[PDB]
Design a protein around this ligand. Structure first.
Ligand SMILES: Nc1ncnc2c1ncn2[C@@H]1O[C@H](COP(=O)(O)OP(=O)(O)OP(=O)(O)O)[C@@H](O)[C@H]1O
Ligand SMILES: Nc1ncnc2c1ncn2[C@@H]1O[C@H](COP(=O)(O)OP(=O)(O)O)[C@@H](O)[C@H]1O
Lengths: 48, 341, 209, 146, 284
């Protein structure tokens, strides 16, 4: 992850930098808290 | 009743807000039913319907051209917007713009009347003639029998006024101006400078008329000597590219503080027609320079002992006098001359 | 002296294909791109049809091949060697006639001056009296002219005026007449133009003489 | 008709929701033309868009994955030349008038004084232009100080 | 100063009763002292006063000498010279005996043989001299004299004085029938500026000269366009004859113009204008 775009309070809209492939934006979901999920470190993006 | 009229007013205001929202909705409709194309560049006009187009940062296809397009307009190097699915030439697109040329041309604030060039009325005559007259009213040249001139040297001491002299004509013509600090053309690569010059002249040949003003031709303008260093030979190559590329309605102004270094070929009358020698102001011109920079007794008294130099020294006179009347102007010129020396 | 114009002539009088390139175009920033471009030019010309490659300004690449003790000059030398090898190498060409123009024929490499690659070595000297007369006639054509003009004086007056500056003489005489509000140029108008083109440098520190 | 218009607000909202499936792509907004945009997707492709609107030519923008749509004397003098013009700009212009290099041996405190005045503290013409683009600016090698 | 302007009246009186050279000499000395002191106001006032004294006098062969000398004296101030020439021309314009006033006009011309600060006054004096000469039963040389001003470089105050200079150049060139020069000057002029508030007599005149030039040349479509601009000019649309003459000329020159795409287009536009007066002649 590269940024959380301030998390916009709700709707965090994180930014991801899938290596050698692309950079995208994501909501993630299914985790406990939008902030304790992650700030700037490795993460596992779902396929589709 | 007035209450019903006010109800009508609020109804109309609500309908106007909803009209703004109708604009938003049609924007959304266009977005939904629009899809982006693929940017590429033609490489060869194959059979009338087949065009070999190279998708930039990708492969090269053979594609078809849709109905409403100018096959004649479509030429090698032209940008094109192919369709994503059927890879058909949806429509052409203007040639690429280099970042350097973009910063060079599209950002050029020029607004100065000839009245703001106090002296140099003659040099104005020659410049304005060579640049403007072939552009506006070329039938004069056609009737005379002479081919229109292209460019002029416009060399002179460091600040007698060259950038301003070119800016005035550029503003009057309101054509495409392209100003270069030629000392920035130099590059640490081995020909990127020649590439930049070629791209500049292609920019000019595209949108015409166009005035190309190159300052400090001393660099990128030196006599070629046999066995200089690698950098010197690269600079000579950049000169040589400029010389050869240097065709229609693209007039040219140079600006330099030295004609000695200039290559004889670069000074050839076929490349630089008129060699103007704007010179440090003489008291006669200096007086009107001060007058125009007045943004008469004091002016004459100042000119009496004025240290005319660099042109901008008189703007310095005026600005310092403001920073501080006849005596105030006189002491301002005293101070600026003392500082300059 | 009118060599690029002679190349422009061919191209308006040649049935064969024409490929005009600039001696400085062959140079490139990336390694090997210059040789690749030279090979591409020659192969394209060979394959298309009877072709004429006008490499104007050849001295940008071809200069004497000295040790060069560096990178960029060695890349330039490789451009030159590729040009030599394509012009006359193992795979001989046919109907790929080549024309190249330079302002300084002394610096060019001695291998790219070899009968078989450059077997003409045409010189374009500054106009003589007779060529000056011919140029003046050709230019003063398509031009209203005063009956009192004596082009013979200008032609005979020994100077170093080239074709380009003769054209400039006529052109600025034309503009002087236009500013003087007249479509028929007088001898005063020429005399002015002739002075302003000769541009005789002076102030030469006199002790040299 | 206002109720039908509200229903059309609803259809617009659901259109936005469906077309805003969040997993977008990010692309440069390189180039900008009109008769539009020429985006450069992060995956090393460049794609034209007729319909996306004042995006900068170079901004990083989201895009649809599929449709691809978007020294007491010295300190006094410096305080003068820096602060007073900023406040009394009109006072300077009253008469009709309109770079400040600082000298000092290594460690004299030029950087310290600039920090005390502070605003941008940038430490070549490219850097010049960018720094003055992004306001007090200090340029070690809008309010200009060098 | 107060002393200067209270001692000037006594010199004026003495000159009025007659002072061939004493008043001139004392005024010259006073001017020398003031100029050395760098008193431009005193210089201007003394010069204007002395020229006025001469003008009140007979001054025949004297005022010209006085002004010429005063101008040729030491490095007088340019503002003082400008004021002197302005007052001189203002007095000159109201004079009779044209053959003799020619001497004073020539004196002004000679003192303004060329100087960046006497340009506009020199231009006006040259125009006046040309007008006088052409009135004096000879314009073949007045046209040439007027065909010297570089008004474009001069840059008069507004686009009125130098535009009038150019229009008078055209008038003299057509009076002498010098059509190449008239046409070149027409190309020099830019017609757009005639679309202004008071550019009515100027525009009518300019178009009239262009029309006469094209009449001599032989074209008809350009003459059609010229009458079209004239008619579109509102003022010629302010009297029955004043506008019907213009419309009739427009129609007749349309007809004279040879058949062509442009000829047909202009015919259609003039026919559809609908203001053809339905006169039983031109409409049909
Ligand atoms: N022999 C000639 N006859 C007529 N005009 C000539 C002649 N030679 C030169 N000119 C004029 O000079 C212009 C420039 O000539 P040209 O570019 O062919 O010269 P060049 O020697 O190749 O120059 P460069 O060394 O600058 O490349 C021509 O367009 C023409 O205007
Ligand atoms: N004749 C003139 N009239 C008014 N200003 C002048 C004149 N000559 C020089 N200047 C002033 O001198 C400055 C010269 O700047 P510039 O033209 O950029 O460099 P250069 O003088 O080397 O061409 C201008 O800012 C201009 O105001």
């Amino acid at each position: 992850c590269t940024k959380i775009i301030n998390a916009d309070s709700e709707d965090p809209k994180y930014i991801i930098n899938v290596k050698q492939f692309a950079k995208f934006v994501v909501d993630l979901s299914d985790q406990v808290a939008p902030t304790d999920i992650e700030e700037g470190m490795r993460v596992g993006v779902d396929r589709n | 009743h007035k209450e019903i009229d006010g109800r009508l007013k609020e109804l109309r205001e609500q309908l106007k807000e909803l009209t703004k929202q109708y604009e938003k909705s049609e924007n959304d409709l266009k977005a939904l039913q629009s899809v982006g194309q693929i940017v590429g560049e033609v490489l060869k006009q194959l059979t009338e319907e087949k065009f070999i187009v190279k998708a930039t940062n990708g492969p090269r296809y053979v594609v078809g051209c849709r109905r409403q397009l100018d096959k004649s307009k479509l030429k090698p190097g032209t940008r094109v917007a192919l369709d994503m699915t059927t890879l058909t030439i949806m429509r052409y697109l203007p040639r690429e713009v280099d970042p350097l040329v973009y910063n060079m041309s599209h950002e050029d604030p020029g607004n100065v009347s000839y009245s703001e060039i106090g002296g140099l009325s003659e040099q104005i005559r020659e410049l304005r003639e060579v640049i403007e007259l072939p552009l506006t009213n070329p039938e004069l040249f056609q009737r005379v029998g002479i081919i229109p001139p292209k460019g002029c040297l416009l060399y002179g001491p460091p600040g007698t006024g060259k950038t301003l002299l070119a800016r005035a004509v550029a503003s009057q013509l309101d054509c495409n101006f392209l100003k270069v600090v030629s000392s920035s053309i130099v590059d640490k690569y081995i020909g990127e400078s020649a590439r930049l010059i070629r791209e500049m002249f292609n920019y000019a040949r595209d949108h015409q008329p166009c005035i190309i003003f190159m300052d400090e031709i001393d660099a990128i303008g030196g006599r070629r000597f046999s066995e200089g260093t690698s950098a010197d030979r690269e600079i000579q190559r950049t000169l040589m590219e400029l010389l050869n590329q240097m065709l229609h309605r693209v007039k040219m102004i140079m600006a330099t503080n030295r004609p000695d270094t200039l290559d004889p070929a670069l000074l050839r009358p076929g490349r630089l027609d008129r060699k103007i020698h704007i010179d440090l102001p003489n008291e006669q011109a200096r007086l009107d320079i001060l007058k125009i920079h007045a943004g008469e007794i004091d002016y004459e008294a100042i000119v009496k002992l004025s240290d005319g130099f660099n042109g901008a020294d008189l703007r310095n006179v005026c600005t310092e006098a403001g920073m501080f009347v006849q005596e105030d102007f006189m002491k301002a010129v005293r101070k600026v001359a003392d500082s300059k020396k | 002296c009118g060599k690029t114009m002679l190349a422009k002539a061919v191209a308006h009088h040649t049935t064969a294909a024409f490929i005009r390139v600039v001696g400085s175009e062959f140079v490139q920033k990336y390694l090997g791109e210059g040789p690749r471009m030279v090979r591409d030019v020659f192969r394209l010309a060979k394959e298309n049809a009877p072709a004429i490659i006008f490499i104007d300004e050849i001295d940008a690449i071809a200069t004497k091949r000295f040790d060069a003790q560096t990178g960029a000059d060695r890349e330039v030398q490789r451009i030159l060697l590729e040009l030599l090898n394509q012009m006359d190498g193992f795979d001989q060409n046919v109907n790929v006639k080549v024309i190249m123009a330079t302002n300084r024929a002394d610096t060019l490499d001695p291998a790219l001056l070899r009968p078989g690659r450059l077997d003409r070595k045409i010189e374009f000297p500054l106009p003589d009296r007779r060529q000056k007369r011919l140029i003046f006639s050709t230019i003063t054509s398509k031009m209203n002219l005063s009956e009192e003009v004596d082009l013979e004086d200008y032609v005979a007056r020994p100077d170093k005026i080239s074709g380009a500056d003769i054209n400039s003489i006529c052109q600025e005489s034309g503009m002087l007449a236009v500013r003087e509000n007249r479509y028929i140029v007088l001898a005063k108008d020429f005399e002015k133009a002739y002075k302003t083109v000769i541009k005789k440098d002076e102030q030469e520190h006199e002790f040299y003489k | 008709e206002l109720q039908a218009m509200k229903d059309k607000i609803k259809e617009n909202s659901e259109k936005i929701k469906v077309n805003k499936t969040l997993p977008y792509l990010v692309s440069n907004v390189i180039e900008l033309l009109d008769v539009c945009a020429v985006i450069k997707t992060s995956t090393r492709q460049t794609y034209f868009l007729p319909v996306i609107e004042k995006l900068k030519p170079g901004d990083l923008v989201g895009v649809n994955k599929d449709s691809y749509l978007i020294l007491d004397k010295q300190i006094q003098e410096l305080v003068e030349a820096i602060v007073l013009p900023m406040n009394h700009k009109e006072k300077f212009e009253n008469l009709g008038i309109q770079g400040v290099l600082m000298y000092g041996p290594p460690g004299t405190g030029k950087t310290l004084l600039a920090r005390a005045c502070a605003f941008l503290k940038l430490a070549g013409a490219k850097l010049v232009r960018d720094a003055f683009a992004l306001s007090i600016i200090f340029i070690d090698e809008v309010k200009v100080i060098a | 100063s107060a002393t200067v302007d209270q001692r000037l009246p006594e010199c004026a009186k003495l000159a009025k009763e007659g002072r061939l050279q004493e008043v001139i000499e004392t005024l010259l000395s006073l001017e020398k002292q003031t100029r050395t002191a760098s008193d431009m106001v005193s210089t201007s006032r003394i010069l204007v006063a002395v020229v006025k004294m001469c003008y009140e006098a007979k001054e025949w062969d004297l005022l010209n000498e006085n002004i010429m000398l005063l101008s040729k004296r030491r490095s007088q101030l340019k503002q003082a010279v400008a004021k002197m020439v302005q007052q001189c021309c203002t007095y000159v314009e109201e004079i009779t005996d044209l053959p003799i006033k020619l001497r004073l006009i020539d004196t002004l011309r000679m003192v303004t043989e060329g100087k960046i600060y006497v340009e506009i006054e020199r231009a006006r004096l040259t125009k006046t001299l040309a007008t006088i000469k052409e009135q004096n039963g000879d314009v073949k040389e007045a046209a040439s004299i007027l065909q010297e001003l570089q008004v474009e470089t001069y840059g008069s105050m507004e686009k009125k004085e130098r535009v009038e200079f150019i229009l008078e150049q055209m008038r003299l060139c057509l009076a002498v029938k010098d059509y190449i020069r008239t046409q070149i000057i027409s190309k020099k002029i830019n017609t757009k500026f005639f679309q202004e508030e008071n550019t009515e007599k100027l525009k009518l005149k300019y178009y009239n000269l262009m029309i006469q030039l094209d009449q001599h040349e032989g074209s008809y479509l350009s003459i059609c366009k010229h009458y079209r601009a004239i008619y579109d000019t509102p003022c010629i649309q302010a009297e029955s004859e004043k506008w019907q003459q213009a419309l009739k000329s427009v129609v007749l020159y349309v007809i004279l113009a040879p058949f062509d795409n442009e000829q047909s287009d202009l015919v259609h536009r003039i026919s559809g204008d609908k203001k053809l007066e339905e006169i039983p002649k031109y409409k049909d």
